[PDB]
Amino acid sequence: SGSMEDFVRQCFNPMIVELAEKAMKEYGEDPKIETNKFAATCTHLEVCFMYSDGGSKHRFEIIEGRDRIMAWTVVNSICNTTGVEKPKFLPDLYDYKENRFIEIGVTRREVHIYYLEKANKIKSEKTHIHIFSFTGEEMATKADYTLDEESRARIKTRLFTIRQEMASRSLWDSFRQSER
Ligand SMILES: O=c1cc(-c2ccc(O)c(O)c2)oc2c([C@@H]3O[C@H](CO)[C@@H](O)[C@H](O)[C@H]3O)c(O)cc(O)c12
Ligand SMILES: [Mn+2]
Ligand SMILES: [Mn+2]
């Protein structure tokens, strides 16, 4: 869907776009062909970045977007230095304030369905899950949202703006239907 490709290149910062293209190609997927996955990958990356800018300076270490060696360097480092259980999958962030890894979910489906799939995927209590939708819904572990409402509101409003713009360009219906 090349009109979606055009949208991704117009919508997302070039750093996010280049990171998403590398990520997909590493799984043998072509951004030019799986354009809905390209937009999805960019959105999750951007949310991960916005979330890391949510609170105090350096509250959050970013793990998402990092090459595997550096990602695992951050994760193993943190687990040696805080004694928190070493996750089996790379999470998205580490919360220095709350001493927990965070998995970040962005879903075109219902938040509760995605929360469960993440929980069942993770199989490790300590890691905090936080889900966003394009429709303003969000849900987190023990209903603990980590950030203040003003920072969550920027993320929720950004995801809404993205859905809206996709909608004006008749890309949203495909994109919504395309998810796992
Ligand atoms: O870099 C990638 C990152 C992720 C990813 C997704 C959710 C997270 O929460 C998360 O931390 C990371 O997913 C990717 C996927 C897929 O994106 C679907 C979502 O649109 C997922 O449902 C699939 O399961 C995935 O394999 C690709 O196809 C290619 C990719 O480079 C990636
Ligand atoms: Mn991740
Ligand atoms: Mn994630």
Author numbering: -2 to 53, 73 to 196
What do the study authors state?
RdRP comprises the subunits PA (polymerase acidic protein), PB1 and PB2 (polymerase basic protein 1 and 2). Subsequently, the PA subunit cleaves the RNA strain approximately 10–13 nucleotides downstream from the 5′-cap to acquire the cap/primer. The PA subunit is a bridged binuclear metalloenzyme with an N-terminal domain (PA-Nter) harboring the endonuclease active site that carries out cleavage of the RNA segment. The active site is a negatively charged pocket that accommodates either Mg2+ or Mn2+ ions, with stronger affinity for the latter.
One key mutation in the influenza A/H1N1 2009 pandemic (A/H1N1pdm) and A/H3N2 viruses is Ile-38 to Thr-38 in PA-Nter. This mutation reduced patient susceptibility to baloxavir marboxil and impaired the virus’ replicative fitness in cells. Using X-ray crystallography, we solved structures of the wild-type PA-N-terminal domain and its I38T mutant in complex with orientin at 1.9 Å and 2.2 Å resolution, respectively. Compared to wild-type PA-Nter, the I38T variant had only 1.9% activity toward the ssRNA substrate and none for ssDNA. However, there is a little ligand shift visible in the mutant variant. Thr-38, which is one atom shorter than Ile-38, helps accommodate orientin. Oγ1Thr-38 forms a hydrogen bond through W21 to the glucosyl moiety of the ligand (O6). Crystallographic study of the orientin complex with I38T PA-Nter revealed an additional point of interaction of the flavonoid with Thr-38 mediated by a water molecule.
